[PDB]
Design a protein around this ligand. Structure first.
Ligand code: BCB
Ligand code: BCB
Ligand code: BCB
Ligand SMILES: C/C=C1/c2cc3[nH]c4c(c3C)C(=O)[C@H](C(=O)OC)c4c3nc(cc4[nH]c(cc(n2)[C@@H]1C)c(C(C)=O)c4C)[C@@H](C)[C@@H]3CCC(=O)OC/C=C(\C)CCC[C@@H](C)CCC[C@@H](C)CCCC(C)C
Ligand SMILES: C/C=C1/c2cc3[nH]c4c(c3C)C(=O)[C@H](C(=O)OC)c4c3nc(cc4[nH]c(cc(n2)[C@@H]1C)c(C(C)=O)c4C)[C@@H](C)[C@@H]3CCC(=O)OC/C=C(\C)CCC[C@H](C)CCC[C@H](C)CCCC(C)C
Ligand SMILES: CC(C)=CCC/C(C)=C/CC/C(C)=C/CC/C(C)=C/CC/C(C)=C/CC/C(C)=C/CC/C(C)=C/CC/C(C)=C/CC/C(C)=C/CC1=C(C)C(=O)c2ccccc2C1=O
Ligand code: HEC
Ligand code: HEC
Ligand code: HEC
Ligand code: HEC
Ligand SMILES: CC(C)=CCC/C(C)=C/C=C/C(C)=C/C=C/C(C)=C/C=C\C=C(C)\C=C\C=C(/C)CC/C=C(\C)CCCC(C)C
Ligand SMILES: CCCCCCCCCCCC[N+](C)(C)[O-]
Ligand SMILES: CCCCCCCCCCCC[N+](C)(C)[O-]
Ligand SMILES: [Fe+2]
Lengths: 258, 323, 332, 273
């Protein structure tokens, strides 16, 4: 006799082989792939005429809604319907649905393509204690630049075209993670300040190089509602403006690199 | 290029943060000190550290196991300091060499090994409590502890469960650098080549998979660091452009995508399955399968090849051949 | 701490299986030169006159040879075994029939052993055969022998450090490692598998599922058996200056047919030959050797694969003297 | 068709080559010039595999095996059935992998995100080249490369390792394995930490970045940080192959003995010998 041998010419390991695959596919398809759909669903498509076709499939692929109880009050439920009625200054380039869209105006200002921001909440991200998380050092006086690193305060900001766009006036730090996330500068020729994510900054000892946008485009950087405070959506608007420059700073950037 | 993804150009400093737990706040010891260079690629703050009964116990049980092993290793070189340093990697504490079944082997042939295993196990269990309780104390889910439990379970599988299932302590993993490595080949050989064990294959698929996923996820978050993608918690509760772009990158590349929260579930799952798959494989080995290669031949999966040099009949089966 | 390319590689298995030898040219060259020291065969002599069984007085093995043929054998033996010591190593210069010197009696037994090897173990030595030189290489004490406990250096012609000395307990692990291609396997494959026929090398099941009756508790061979067999294979590989794929398709070490090369079968016969040599010819010699030749357990030095092969898949790369000295076998 | 937030991102541009020619989507998939070349290489490679297999002894998924040429063919071409198919399939594979990587660059460009993913993907492509091209080139024969078979490639890995007696003692392997283990462990830690903070359970409140850092500071006395754990993860994963490659390339071209013996550089120092 043999340990593991069963009737019908089969054995225990052989059965477990099928069971393992069943467990794997069940978790992957029924659980994980549904968790993957808590954002962006149900999908959308051009109608042109009032029609109703929810489709069983749109219900089957979704998991039951979950609700997050926020640390500072309120709740968030996903998935949930989140239509984007915001007018997009984009036009079709061709007829087929797979065709890309083309901006109709200034993509950076209109916020389309890589210049798009998400409809995040217009609330100030908070520290565990309920204070504003991302703030300038003028406010977070108990914070400072580590000894050994460049203090950008006072340095000029040089855009992709080589011309000075303004002067750095402060640094916005993440009080929750002790990490700088933005630099604030005065825009030359204009009468305003503007933030820029550090990820778009090449910090040199004598200057801050920014290749994402040209000097002139600094004038239209999204503005904050408050001076020493920034909302989650504003951070998205600011970061997205510069990213948009990577593809739209000049007409050439959107065309093939090679 | 986003230089911030390589290292932190301008580091920040501020009062250290302390999040109160339901208990144990008075068990935190030390004074946080900072490292400027570590701050280039990570948080500059080191310490303080939490003590607590679980952690202390873990070190007590662990230190004992370690001393049992080190002492037996020292005996291997007749307690000579120079040879101990030189031969370290080659030294080890072995399970019983003789077959006593499940009988407690004498100290000189498996006894000390069994003792070290017991203390290591207690050490692992104690540290698990720390991993679990710290989460609950800080009001966090226990996802990490459940993953850690699977890793611990696998160690128990190769350490004592498989041995108990076949009825022999001689099958355990010895303690030592090279010695625990040698066991791998001894075990694979004894059970007909582990490459043919499906669960060895599953475990590898998930391990390689973890490599693929962390490289992919790590790179994805760095790619959207300019949009604050690293602040995953709030990207989960309030989707930002960082994760919309991350999702679209993958959707446009492979045809489907995850969410900033679910990708962590995929990673947690893949990591978990490395240990779960390995454990199932070890539980089936010796218990219900004796030779994995032959098991695959039996089920028609094993590849076969023509001979290059002449096919060679087993000499032992030839007519008139000796024993 | 590396070997500069190119590397010589051969194929020993179906294409795509990564099977074959991996050799370093400079090493191969150095070994061929060492082995090339094999003295050439002595000039042939006319077989004239009566057999030495009538001419001499104490010839028991080579009695059928003529005087000239016989003296030719003695010259070769001196060349192969004691070229530095000379005829008197085994002989009393005043009475060539005397057995007073211990090497004489041992040599006679060795003549019988050599003839047995070339006559009874052709399954291993084929028509290449062996001569006294194969093992001795020009010295009374063969450079590569084994005792009942691992010894270092492997080549006894090299002066051992204090830690290599078998009396120094602190160096045991190293004495073991250097006998198993530097692995940390805690087993001595010589005493376990080559000194005698008490153990089985095979440790892999021949069925997919565990047979009820031999797969639980004390019915089972300890896993240590698998480590030990792995140790023997590491030792065998190093002894022949080759790797596992020279004999096995690692897909299944336990299978023969297309899963093993002809060399593996020859190796199998070699294990039987060595056990025969050790149990029936070499081990019994401890009663004829001086205490200074015996191991700490009173054992006489014995043979393993390296004793003849000395790092080459074929001893002396296949060199032969079989036809030059038919008196050494095969004996019809 | 489109995720609810996807439309605004589907703009033209970002390509490396081709421009508007292939700048479009097919279902969820972005095409692009490299999307076209990828499909080309995939179709060709898979077709070659299928035809090569049809000339083989079996249709079983696990047993099928398309192998390289005998070592004797060196770096030259070999008859189709005797390694030729394998050679063609290898070229298609490389073309497909590289096209896939460059396509990811175009997708990254269009979205305005960093090129970190495709850059990371270059690592496994590189390892594939180390195994199938670089090492075989150094040894002088395509025949040293691994075969294409679900189980047969394991037989190759197996024999390759044993060609050096015990591959586990290979220093480059030891590094590679350590990175594999720590990366799998770290991924579990990272995924678990994030999930534990967003899912405290029992109706409790979602926690914070502060709680994140507090957890590991308490458990191990240090917390690398939110952004840093992602850089670390990419570093750990990448090094599985970046360091492993050295152990692979060294076996044969720079070392022909067993790997355990290599450690003689340490063990055989006369001082303690
Ligand atoms: C130096 C060592 C090597 C190695 C060692 C290795 C081991 C030891 C094991 C595997 C295993 C596996 N390997 Mg192999 N491997 C494979 C593919 C595979 C899979 C059949 C399987 C699981 C892989 C996985 O899930 O991780 C990546 C993970 C994920 C989650 C993404 C999905 C990947 C998908 C499963 C790949 C499917 C590939 C297809 C079967 C064939 C592709 C071509 C077709 C379409 C024509 C590829 C495609 C390549 C290439 C192109 O180089 C490769 C190279 C190598 N493997 C090296 C030669 N691999 C395991 C196995 O079960 O083998 C039977 C196993 O035990
Ligand atoms: C010749 C021998 C072979 C072999 C033998 C082997 C065996 C015998 C086993 C594996 C197993 C496994 N192998 Mg295989 N293997 C693998 C990969 C893998 C892993 C995916 C998997 C699980 C091991 C693990 O994660 O442990 C790393 C993780 C561990 C050990 C968990 C530790 C957790 C713990 C809490 C840590 C504690 C730390 C404390 C500080 C300790 C303190 C101690 C003190 C107190 C004393 C690959 C990719 C390859 C290739 C490329 O060839 C391969 C080839 C082979 N393996 C050969 C065929 N392999 C296992 C398996 O899956 O079997 C089915 C297994 O048991
Ligand atoms: C008996 C033989 C042994 C052996 C022999 C061995 C060799 C010979 C080599 C390794 C290597 C490696 N081994 Mg070792 N090994 C490992 C682990 C590992 C890996 C970390 C490492 C790299 C694997 C690799 O190259 O993938 C390669 C994977 C590639 C190239 C994947 C490329 C993917 C591609 C870009 C895209 C593919 C796409 C698909 C076709 C898509 C399909 C379509 C679908 C998905 C839609 C462990 C943990 C163990 C254990 C537990 O014992 C072990 C034991 C052993 N290994 C044995 C001792 N191992 C390698 C190494 O680094 O050594 C230093 C190596 O060369
Ligand atoms: C697929 C998923 C996997 C996975 C998962 C997870 N892995 C986890 C967790 C999860 C989820 C945790 O939550 C837990 C953790 O906390 O993370 C930070 C942990 C851990 N994984 C560790 C090691 C590890 N994981 C491995 C593998 C995998 N992990 C696989 C891959 C491997 C491999 C590959 O070998 C290793 C080596 C530890 C760091 C840690 C346990 C600590 C412990 O339990 O120790 C218990 C305590 C002790 C042994 C005492 C230590 C005493 C020391 C300091 C010596 C003192 C000597 C002194 C007294 C001498 C004096 C005398 C002398 C001078 C003469
Ligand atoms: C160190 C870092 C690691 C790492 C990293 C990353 N990994 C990535 C990315 C990153 C960052 C991506 O961005 C990219 C991706 O999109 O993710 C979703 C990707 C991907 N990693 C895949 C497989 C994978 N990653 C492995 C390993 C690691 N990944 C290591 C650990 C392994 C191992 C271990 O075996 C596997 C099997 C695919 C799923 C996917 C490419 C699909 C493709 O290229 O499309 C183009 C090609 C095809 C769809 C098919 C081509 C078929 C050819 C023509 C015919 C067959 C030829 C073939 C040689 C036959 C082999 C047979 C086999 C039995 C032997
Ligand atoms: C002969 C023959 C073969 C003929 C047919 C050829 C063919 C394929 C034709 C198709 C049709 C045509 C002509 C199409 C044109 C367009 C085109 C270029 C199509 C491509 C088709 C194709 C080749 C598809 C295969 C795609 C593919 C390689 C899939 C692999 C999927 C696998 C196994 C991935 C491994 C990793 C894994 C387990 C992932 C799951 C979890 C996910 C989704 C992680 C990604 C992810 C990460 C990592 C985040 O960090 C993240 C952060 C925040 C939000 C989201 C995410 C997120 O989604
Ligand atoms: C030991 C390794 C030997 C060396 C060196 C030499 N001889 Fe030898 N010889 C040896 C043995 C074992 C025997 C007996 C052979 C047998 O078949 O029994 C002999 C015998 C002789 C004899 C015969 C003496 C007699 O019985 O009358 C002679 C003449 C002889 N040996 C000569 C000889 C010479 C000249 C040597 C150096 C060239 C020499 N022997 C070396 C063993 C060994
Ligand atoms: C390897 C298989 C051998 C062959 C072939 C021959 N000999 Fe040998 N011999 C061998 C060993 C392992 C030993 C034991 C160790 C030792 O040195 O004693 C010997 C020993 C002798 C001796 C005595 C050596 C001494 O102690 O002084 C002699 C004189 C001797 N062998 C002679 C000899 C002759 C004449 C051979 C060919 C006919 C011959 N040996 C072959 C191993 C092997
Ligand atoms: C030919 C010279 C060999 C080399 C080189 C290696 N092996 Fe071997 N192996 C060989 C033989 C003749 C035998 C059988 C001996 C007998 O008395 O039956 C073996 C056996 C094994 C086994 C056991 C198989 C079984 O049936 O249980 C294993 C697992 C094995 N060999 C492994 C192995 C490895 C890893 C090697 C390189 C380090 C290796 N062998 C080399 C002959 C030869
Ligand atoms: C001298 C008495 C030997 C001992 C001890 C061992 N081997 Fe041997 N081996 C010997 C000879 C004279 C030959 C040559 C055969 C030829 O055709 O030239 C061999 C051959 C082998 C081979 C085959 C080599 C090949 O064909 O390429 C192998 C694999 C082999 N020997 C293995 C082997 C092993 C494993 C041994 C110890 C158990 C062993 N041999 C001892 C002589 C002697
Ligand atoms: C006792 C009875 C009745 C029942 C059984 C009890 C039981 C639960 C037994 C369990 C056994 C188990 C789980 C055994 C498992 C063994 C395993 C998996 C071991 C694996 C590998 C071990 C290795 C790598 C250990 C290496 C150890 C050493 C290097 C020595 C330790 C050294 C240190 C950690 C610090 C460095 C010290 C040095 C500088 C001097
Ligand atoms: C594996 C058994 C270990 C027993 C010894 C360790 C006990 C630790 C108890 C910790 C109690 C923690 N607490 C207070 C949070 O409940
Ligand atoms: C060891 C193999 C583990 C495989 C785990 C699953 C791999 C990824 C599966 C993706 C499936 C995608 N989709 C859209 C069909 O759901
Ligand atoms: Fe993450």
């Amino acid at each position: 006799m043999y340990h593991g041998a069963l009737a019908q010419h089969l054995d225990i390991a052989q059965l477990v082989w099928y069971a393992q695959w069943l467990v794997i596919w069940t978790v992957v398809l029924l659980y994980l792939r549904r968790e993957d759909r808590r954002e962006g669903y149900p999908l959308v498509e051009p109608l042109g005429l009032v029609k109703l076709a929810p489709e069983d499939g749109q219900v089957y692929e979704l998991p039951y809604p979950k609700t997050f109880v926020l640390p500072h009050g309120g709740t968030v439920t996903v998935p949930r319907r989140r239509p984007e009625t915001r007018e997009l200054k984009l036009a079709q380039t061709d007829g087929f649905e797979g065709a890309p869209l083309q901006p109709t105006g200034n993509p950076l200002v209109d916020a389309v393509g890589p210049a798009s921001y998400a409809e995040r909440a217009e609330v100030v991200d908070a520290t565990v204690d309920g204070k504003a998380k991302i703030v300038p050092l003028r406010v977070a006086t108990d914070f400072s630049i580590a000894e050994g690193d460049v203090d950008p305060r006072g340095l000029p900001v040089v855009a992709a075209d080589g011309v000075e766009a303004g002067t750095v006036t402060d640094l916005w730090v993440d009080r929750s993670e002790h990490y700088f996330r933005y630099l604030e500068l005065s825009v030359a020729g204009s009468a305003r300040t503007a933030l820029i994510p550090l990820g778009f900054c090449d910090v040199k000892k004598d200057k801050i190089v920014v290749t994402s946008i040209l000097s002139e485009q600094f004038a239209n950087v999204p503005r904050l509602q408050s001076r020493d405070q920034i909302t989650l959506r504003e951070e998205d608007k600011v970061s997205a403006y510069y990213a948009g420059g990577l593809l739209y700073a000049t007409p050439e950037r959107a065309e093939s690199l090679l | 290029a986003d230089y911030q993804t390589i290292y932190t150009q301008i580091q920040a400093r501020g009062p250290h943060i302390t999040v109160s737990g339901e208990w144990g706040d008075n068990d935190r010891v030390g004074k946080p000190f900072y490292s400027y260079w570590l701050g280039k690629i990570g948080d500059a703050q080191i310490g303080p550290i939490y003590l607590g009964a679980s952690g202390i116990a873990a070190f007590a049980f662990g230190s004992t196991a370690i001393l049992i092993i080190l002492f037996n290793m020292a005996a291997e070189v007749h307690f000579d300091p120079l040879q101990f340093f030189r031969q370290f990697f080659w030294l080890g504490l072995y399970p019983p060499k003789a077959q006593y079944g499940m009988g407690i082997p004498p100290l000189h042939d498996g006894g000390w090994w069994l003792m070290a295993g017991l203390f290591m196990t207690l050490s692992l269990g104690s540290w698990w409590i720390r991993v679990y309780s710290r989460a609950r104390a800080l009001g966090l889910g226990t996802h990490i502890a459940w993953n850690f439990a699977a890793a611990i379970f696998f160690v128990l599988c190769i350490g004592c469960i498989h041995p108990t299932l076949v009825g022999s302590w001689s099958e355990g993993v010895p303690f030592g650098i090279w010695p625990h490595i040698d066991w791998l080949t001894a075990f694979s050989i004894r059970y007909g080549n582990f490459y043919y064990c499906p669960w060895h294959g599953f475990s590898i698929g998930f391990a390689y998979g973890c490599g693929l996923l962390f490289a992919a996820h790590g790179a994805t978050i760095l790619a959207v660091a300019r949009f604050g993608g690293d602040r995953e918690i709030e990207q989960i509760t309030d989707r930002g452009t960082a994760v919309e772009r991350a999702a679209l990158f993958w959707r446009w590349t492979i045809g489907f995508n995850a969410t900033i929260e679910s990708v962590h579930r995929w990673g947690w799952f893949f990591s978990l399955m490395v240990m779960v798959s390995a454990s199932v494989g070890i539980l089936l080995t010796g218990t219900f399968v004796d030779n994995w290669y032959l098991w695959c031949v039996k089920h028609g999966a094993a590849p076969d090849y023509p001979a290059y040099l002449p096919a060679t009949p087993d000499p032992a089966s030839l007519p008139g051949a000796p024993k | 701490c590396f070997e500069p390319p190119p590397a010589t590689t051969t194929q020993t298995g179906f294409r795509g299986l990564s099977m074959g030898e991996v050799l370093h040219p400079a090493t191969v060259k150095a070994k061929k030169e060492r082995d090339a020291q094999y003295p050439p065969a002595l000039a042939a002599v006319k077989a004239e006159g009566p057999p030495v069984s009538q001419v001499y007085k104490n010839v028991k093995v080579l009695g059928n040879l003529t005087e000239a043929e016989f003296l030719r054998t003695m010259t070769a033996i001196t060349e192969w075994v004691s070229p530095q010591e000379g005829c008197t190593y085994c002989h009393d210069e005043n009475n060539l029939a005397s057995e007073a010197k211990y090497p004489y009696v041992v040599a006679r037994r060795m003549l019988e052993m050599t003839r047995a090897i070339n006559t009874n173990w052709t399954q291993h030595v084929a028509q290449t055969g062996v001569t006294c030189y194969t093992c001795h290489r020009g010295t009374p004490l063969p450079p590569y022998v084994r005792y009942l406990e691992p010894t270092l250096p492997l080549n006894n012609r090299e002066t051992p450090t204090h830690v290599e000395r078998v009396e120094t307990r602190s160096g045991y692990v190293v004495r073991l490692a250097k006998y198993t291609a530097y692995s940390a396997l805690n087993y001595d494959p010589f005493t376990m598998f080559l000194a005698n026929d008490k153990r089985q090398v095979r440790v892999v099941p021949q069925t997919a599922l565990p047979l009820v009756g031999v797969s639980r508790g004390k019915e089972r061979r300890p896993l240590s058996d698998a480590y030990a067999t792995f140790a023997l294979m590491m030792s065998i590989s190093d002894s022949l200056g080759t790797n596992c794929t020279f004999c096995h398709n690692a897909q299944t070490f336990e299978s023969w047919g297309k899963k093993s090369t002809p060399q593996r079968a020859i190796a199998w016969w070699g294990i039987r030959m060595v056990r025969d040599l050790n149990m029936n010819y070499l081990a019994p010699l401890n009663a004829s050797l001086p205490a200074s030749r015996l191991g700490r357990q009173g054992e006489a030095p014995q043979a393993d694969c390296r004793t003849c092969h000395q790092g080459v898949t074929k001893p002396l790369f296949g060199a032969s003297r079989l036809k030059d000295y038919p008196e050494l076998g095969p004996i019809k | 068709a489109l995720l609810s937030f996807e439309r605004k991102y589907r703009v033209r541009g970002g390509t490396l080559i081709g421009g508007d020619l292939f700048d479009f989507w097919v279902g969820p998939y972005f095409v692009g010039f490299f999307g076209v070349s990828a499909i080309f290489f995939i179709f060709l490679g898979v077709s070659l595999i299928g035809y090569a297999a049809s000339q083989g002894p079996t249709w079983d998924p696990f047993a099928i095996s398309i192998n390289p040429p005998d070592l004797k063919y060196g770096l030259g071409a070999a008859p189709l059935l005797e390694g030729g198919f394998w050679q063609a399939i290898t070229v298609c594979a490389l073309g497909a992998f590289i096209s896939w990587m460059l396509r990811e660059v175009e997708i990254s460009r269009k979205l305005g995100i960093g090129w970190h993913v495709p850059l990371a993907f270059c690592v496994p492509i590189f390892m594939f080249c180390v195994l199938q091209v670089f090492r075989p080139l150094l040894l002088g024969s395509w025949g040293h490369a691994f075969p294409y078979g679900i189980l047969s490639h394991l037989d190759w890995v197996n024999n390759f390792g044993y060609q050096y007696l015990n591959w586990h003692y290979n220093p480059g392997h030891m590094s590679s394995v350590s990175f594999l283990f720590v990366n799998a462990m770290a991924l579990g830690l990272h995924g678990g930490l994030i999930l534990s903070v967003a899912n405290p359970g029992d109706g409790d409140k979602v926690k914070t970045a502060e709680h994140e850092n507090q957890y590991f500071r308490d458990v191990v006395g240090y917390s690398i940080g939110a952004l840093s754990i992602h850089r670390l993860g990419l570093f750990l994963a990448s090094n599985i192959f970046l360091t492993g490659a050295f152990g692979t390339i060294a076996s044969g071209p720079f070392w022909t003995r067993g790997w355990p013996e290599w450690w003689g550089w340490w063990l055989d120092i006369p001082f303690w010998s």
